[PDB]
């Protein structure tokens, strides 16, 4: 069930991320992570750790936001797995 919790929290990091990311990126010349929408696309593929590179942070706080988003993705992922694992182990104890 904490995996469920993980999903909620993630979706929140996915939004706060998109936000901060644009907030952090504007002002730094050449930055492309400056509009709310694609920002969100950016966070989604960075969380899924797929990161095509069509968009990437260039500032320090932008990268920090980045790191956090990465970890919410790499964690939820693991937590859903760790969950699944347990379910099958219990199911199997029969």
């Amino acid at each position: 069930r904490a995996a469920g919790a993980a999903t909620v929290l993630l979706v929140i990091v996915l939004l706060a991320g998109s936000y901060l990311a644009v907030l952090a990126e504007r002002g730094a010349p050449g930055a492309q992570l400056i509009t709310y929408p694609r920002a969100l696309w950016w966070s989604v593929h960075t969380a899924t750790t797929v990161g095509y590179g069509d968009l990437y942070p260039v500032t320090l706080w932008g990268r920090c936001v980045a790191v956090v988003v990465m970890v919410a993705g790499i964690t939820s992922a693991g937590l859903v797995t760790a969950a699944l694992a347990t379910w099958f182990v219990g199911r199997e104890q029969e």
Partner: antibody, heavy 118, light 108 residues
Framework: QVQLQQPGAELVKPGASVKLSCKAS????????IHWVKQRPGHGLEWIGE????????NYNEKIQKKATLTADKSSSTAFMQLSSLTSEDSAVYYC???????????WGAGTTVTVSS | DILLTQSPAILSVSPGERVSFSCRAS??????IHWYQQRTNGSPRLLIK???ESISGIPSRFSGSGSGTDFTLSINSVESEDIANYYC?????????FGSGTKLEIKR
């Protein structure tokens, strides 16, 4: 309805500093960015700076000599630009537009004619 | 910072004719180009957004086109009211930037 309301004009003595206003109404959002474009008579539009009211962060145009300082009054929904120590060169029409965070300037203001003279 | 070049500065066209203004980015900016129209003593007015998307309130006469570095604003059948100044502006890379503008003149 006329969303961005800007004072028709301001006269300013060389060296002095004016504080232009822009009071918005209509659909406001936390993702809202208020911009400032300066158009010298007979010339093109020139980005001056931008500000995100729901946070107060402000960035300016790095090529032009900074002669402005953006601020936003959370409650009264008004954006203020502080153009200090002016000169004939600063004399122009200043607009303020609202940007939803998607890149384009949806709506602009009427513009505040500023004339720097004695 | 991206440089939007707008040539020519003036366009002389006959009524009801089809006119096209071009904006060229110093580098690829996708479709993140937007066009504003400003008349004599008027403010800018969003015409097209994202190179080719409609804005409620703008004649269907106006259309957008292009991607990457070359974009084209277009008016199918010019008309007295369309006399103004046309500027393009990108929002691909910070800071946003404008074009030099293009004056449209009709030939009555």
């Amino acid at each position: 309805q006329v969303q961005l309301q800007q004072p028709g004009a301001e006269l300013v003595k060389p060296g002095a500093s004016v504080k232009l206003s822009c009071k918005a109404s209509g659909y406001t959002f936390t993702s809202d960015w208020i911009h400032w474009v300066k158009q010298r008579p007979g010339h093109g539009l020139e980005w001056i700076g931008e500000i995100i009211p729901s946070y107060g962060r402000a960035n300016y145009n790095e090529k032009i000599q900074k002669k402005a300082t953006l601020t936003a009054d959370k409650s009264s929904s008004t954006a203020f630009m502080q153009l200090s120590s002016l000169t004939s060169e600063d004399s122009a029409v200043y607009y303020c537009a609202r940007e939803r965070g998607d890149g384009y300037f949806a709506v602009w203001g009427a513009g505040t004619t500023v004339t720097v003279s004695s | 910072d991206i440089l939007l070049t707008q040539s020519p500065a003036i366009l002389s066209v006959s009524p009801g004719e089809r006119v096209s203004f071009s904006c060229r980015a110093s580098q690829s900016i996708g479709t993140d180009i937007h066009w504003y129209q400003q008349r004599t003593n008027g403010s800018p007015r969003l015409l097209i957004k994202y190179a080719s998307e409609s804005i409620s309130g703008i004649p269907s006469r106006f259309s957008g086109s292009g991607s990457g570095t070359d974009f084209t604003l277009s008016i199918n059948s010019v008309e007295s009211e369309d006399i103004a100044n046309y500027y393009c502006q990108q929002s691909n890379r910070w800071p946003f930037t404008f074009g030099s503008g293009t004056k449209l003149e009709i030939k009555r």
